Amino acid sequence: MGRRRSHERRDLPPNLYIRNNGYYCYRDPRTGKEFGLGRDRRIAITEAIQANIELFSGHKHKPL
DNA sequence: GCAGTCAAAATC
DNA sequence: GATTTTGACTGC
């Protein structure tokens, strides 16, 4: 794709990126657009991580 | 200089 | 069309 991995995304969860103004944002998988989360790193990241838990509700596939 | 959203490019 | 992460843009 255009951007696979970045330095800021190294500390961010999936569906969450940081802008140039130090503001984080959550991208929706329905359209790819997003909204401002928070200017804190552990805050915006923690928020996107929770949503990822629900988004990951489906994963168990007969693991061993 | 913050606050909040959509486009850019490249892939499958 | 989907995705994935960064860039640009507007308003005060």
Curated annotation (Swiss-Prot):
Signal peptide: none
Summary of subunit composition and partner proteins: Homotetramer. Interacts (via N-terminus) with the excisionase (via C-terminus). Part of the excision complex made of the integrase tetramer, IHF, Fis and Xis.
Similarity comment: Belongs to the 'phage' integrase family.
Physiological role: Integrase is necessary for integration of the phage into the host genome by site-specific recombination. In conjunction with excisionase, integrase is also necessary for excision of the prophage from the host genome.
Protein name as catalogued: Integrase
Name of encoding gene: int
Included range, full protein: 1 to 64 of 356
